[PDB]
């Protein structure tokens, strides 16, 4: 469920190893 | 799977987004329900 892990992370970022860099920049976009 | 009666301690706690370790939802229904609840809490 790694795709489900990415979904459950991504839908929880905006709602509250370069993929982690895209996640932290997307958290900046979220805020 | 310890979400028997302690759902209140996560539910009203995530209204305020207090960064407090309460419970990690292991069910997909609970995660979708939290995605409804916290998004309502943001506009609230």
Curated annotation (Swiss-Prot), chain A:
Describe the PTM: NMDA is probably regulated by C-terminal phosphorylation of an isoform of NR1 by PKC. Its phosphorylated state is influenced by the formation of the NMDAR-PPP2CB complex and the NMDAR channel activity.
Subcellular localization(s) per the UniProt record = Cell membrane; Postsynaptic cell membrane; Synaptic cell membrane; Postsynaptic density membrane
Instruction: Report residue spans for region: Pore-forming.
Output: 3-16
Superkingdom to which the source organism belongs: Eukaryota
Which stretches face the Cytoplasmic side?
17-20
Could you list which ranges are intramembrane per the record? 3-16
UniProt domain comment: A hydrophobic region that gives rise to the prediction of a transmembrane span does not cross the membrane, but is part of a discontinuously helical region that dips into the membrane and is probably part of the pore and of the selectivity filter. The extracellular N-terminal domain (ATD) is a site of allosteric regulation to modulate overall receptor function.
Complex and partners: Heterotetramer; the NMDAR subunits are modular and harbor tiered domains that function in concert to regulate opening and closing of the cation-selective ion channel pore. Forms heterotetrameric channels composed of two GluN1/zeta subunits (GRIN1), and two identical GluN2/epsilon subunits (GRIN2A, GRIN2B, GRIN2C or GRIN2D) or GluN3 subunits (GRIN3A or GRIN3B) (in vitro). Can also form heterotetrameric channels that contain at least two GluN1 subunits and at least two different GluN2 subunits (or a combination of one GluN2 and one GluN3 subunits) (in vitro).
Which purpose does this protein serve, as stated in its record?
A: Component of N-methyl-D-aspartate (NMDA) receptors (NMDARs) that function as heterotetrameric, ligand-gated cation channels with high calcium permeability and voltage-dependent block by Mg(2+). NMDARs participate in synaptic plasticity for learning and memory formation by contributing to the long-term potentiation (LTP). Channel activation requires binding of the neurotransmitter L-glutamate to the GluN2 subunit, glycine or D-serine binding to the GluN1 subunit, plus membrane depolarization to eliminate channel inhibition by Mg(2+).
This chain belongs to the protein called Glutamate receptor ionotropic, NMDA 1
* Species in which this protein is naturally found: Rattus norvegicus
Q: Which gene encodes it?
A: Grin1
Q: What stretch of the whole protein does this chain cover?
A: 601 to 641 of 938
Swiss-Prot record, chain B:
Q: Which organism is it from?
A: Rattus norvegicus
Taxonomy-wise, where does this protein's organism fall, top ranks first? Eukaryota, Metazoa, Chordata, Craniata, Vertebrata
Residues the record annotates as the site (Functional determinant of NMDA receptors) are 17
Q: What is known of its domains?
A: Contains an N-terminal domain, a ligand-binding domain and a transmembrane domain. Agonist binding to the extracellular ligand-binding domains triggers channel gating. A hydrophobic region that gives rise to the prediction of a transmembrane span does not cross the membrane, but is part of a discontinuously helical region that dips into the membrane and is probably part of the pore and of the selectivity filter.
Q: What does this protein do?
A: Component of N-methyl-D-aspartate (NMDA) receptors (NMDARs) that function as heterotetrameric, ligand-gated cation channels with high calcium permeability and voltage-dependent block by Mg(2+). NMDARs participate in synaptic plasticity for learning and memory formation by contributing to the slow phase of excitatory postsynaptic current, long-term synaptic potentiation, and learning.
Q: Where is the protein found, in the record's own terms?
A: Cell projection, Dendritic spine; Cell membrane; Synapse; Postsynaptic cell membrane
The annotated subunit structure for this chain is: Heterotetramer. Forms heterotetrameric channels composed of two GluN1/zeta subunits (GRIN1), and two identical GluN2/epsilon subunits (GRIN2A, GRIN2B, GRIN2C or GRIN2D) or GluN3 subunits (GRIN3A or GRIN3B) (in vitro). Can also form heterotetrameric channels that contain at least two GluN1 subunits and at least two different GluN2 subunits (or a combination of one GluN2 and one GluN3 subunits) (in vitro). In vivo, the subunit composition may depend on the expression levels of the different subunits. Found in a complex with GRIN1, GRIN3A and PPP2CB. Found in a complex with GRIN1 and GRIN3B.
This protein is called: Glutamate receptor ionotropic, NMDA 2A
Q: Which segments sit in the membrane without spanning it?
A: 4-18
In this entry, the parts of the chain located on the Cytoplasmic side of the membrane are 19-27
Q: Which residues cross the membrane?
A: 28-44
Residue segments, region Pore-forming: 2-23
Q: In which tissues is it expressed?
A: Detected in brain cortex, olfactory bulb, hippocampus including the dentate gyrus, striatum, thalamus, superior colliculus, inferior colliculus, midbrain and cerebellum (at protein level). Detected in brain cortex, hypothalamus and cerebellum.
The entry sums up its family as follows: Belongs to the glutamate-gated ion channel (TC 1.A.10.1) family. NR2A/GRIN2A subfamily.
* Domain of life of the source: Eukaryota
């Amino acid at each position: 469920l790694t795709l489900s892990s990415a979904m459950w992370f991504s839908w929880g970022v905006l709602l509250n190893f370069s993929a982690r860099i895209l996640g932290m920049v997307w958290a900046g976009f979220a805020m | 799977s310890f979400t028997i009666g302690k759902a209140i301690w996560l539910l009203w706690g995530l209204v305020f987004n207090n960064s407090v370790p309460v419970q990690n939802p292991k069910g997909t229904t609970s995660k979708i329900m939290v995605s409804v609840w916290a998004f309502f809490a943001v506009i609230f």
